[PDB]
């Protein structure tokens, strides 16, 4: 059994950062050094565990989260960050044990007039909790009077698009991000290195 990283990394379309995908990966043998030596990634940062050791460690379950952001926000995908991604879209815990991979995708996820398929939650009542997900589009109430699903002053549609374009800056260009998480639970280990 070989862990199915091939359709997680090389998926034809990634999600948005508010409605991010997850995938459970169990009962398989994964070689992490073959990923680390792809060298086609802008960012490969492992927290809580050192690479070159992932083949010598064995975990109950691992999870692969996939989402697209802009280049300047990959700094926010990390333990202890703060922003409009670490608070409202994707939050990583202080006890993270995994690896954040990220790579430029201006070829696939950008269009001449703009690509409005990729969204992010701009306003939210409170900060996300570690690994929580929020896909509601309820009108955000910014004042004292309720917003019964109708827009106006004081009431905002919370999501908003990135509007990727082929010639945006390098910090405003699409970046595909895959967060691998490893869990050590009191149970037989199923996903394990070679």
């Amino acid at each position, epitope marked *: 059994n070989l862990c199915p990283f091939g359709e997680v990394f090389n998926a034809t379309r990634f999600a948005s950062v508010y409605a991010w995908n997850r995938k459970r990966i169990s009962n398989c043998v994964a070689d992490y050094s073959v990923l680390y030596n792809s060298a086609s990634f802008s960012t490969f940062k492992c927290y809580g565990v050192s690479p070159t050791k992932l083949n010598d460690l064995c975990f109950t379950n691992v999870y692969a989260d996939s989402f697209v952001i802009r280049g300047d926000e990959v700094r926010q995908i990390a333990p202890g960050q703060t922003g409009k991604i670490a608070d409202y879209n994707y939050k990583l815990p202080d006890d993270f044990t995994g690896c954040v991979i990220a790579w430029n995708s201006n070829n696939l996820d950008s269009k001449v007039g703009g690509n409005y398929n990729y969204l992010y939650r701009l306003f939210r009542k409170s900060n996300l909790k570690p*690994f929580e997900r929020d896909i509601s589009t309820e009108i955000y109430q910014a004042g004292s009077t309720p917003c019964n699903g109708v827009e106006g002053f004081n009431c905002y549609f919370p999501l908003q698009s990135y509007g990727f374009q082929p010639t945006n800056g390098v910090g405003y260009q699409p970046y595909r991000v895959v967060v691998l998480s490893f869990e050590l639970l009191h149970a037989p280990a199923t996903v394990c290195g070679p």
Partner: antibody
Amino acid sequence: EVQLVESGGGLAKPGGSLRLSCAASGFTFSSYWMNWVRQAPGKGLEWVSVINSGGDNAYYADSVKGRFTTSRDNSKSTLSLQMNSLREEDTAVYYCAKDRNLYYYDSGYYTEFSFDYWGQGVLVTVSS
Amino acid sequence: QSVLTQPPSVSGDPGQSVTISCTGSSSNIGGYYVNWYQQFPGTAPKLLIYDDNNRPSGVSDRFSGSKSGTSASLTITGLQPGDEADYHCSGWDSSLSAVLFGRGTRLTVL
């Protein structure tokens, strides 16, 4: 072994309310996310809802969203489903599945459920 | 596509092999795990194959599960007249973010 015993089915006129209770023993109940699945008479299977290890965040199918409500009491080690505003297309058998896997964060978004231990199935007919 | 399509019924002579097919989509099986359940008429379903390849402890090695791209399959080698049941293919859909199921297939032996 692992025992799932359902109770609380019967007759209800369209618009009535019922409360199914699933007594679960043989495993640490608090630790596993618990499901509710349902089967129409002779027509496939269909998933209904899921509840966490602590009962804080429940998720429902869209066909039953806003009407049914899943709950669980880890003190008495029981599961419960409160059905309100019933329709006659809710004539089914309701199984109390269990999540095969073990999750760490109890609040994150986990994305594949395999059910290893089901229940006998209470028959809920909604008619007059 | 949010729909998993099994045949309504498959048939095979005893002792031979039988293949059941479940063709989903990309957000379905194509990108996520599959589970096959078995249900004898009048009783609950039990986990037959999980994660599209494995078997739990109590399940015998006559049932094999596979999944390759869009479609998954179940193979039964050796057809005892006593394993007649309903076989439920259970993908997961990222679009709906909920567990999918199939119409179930009535395995009949000749």
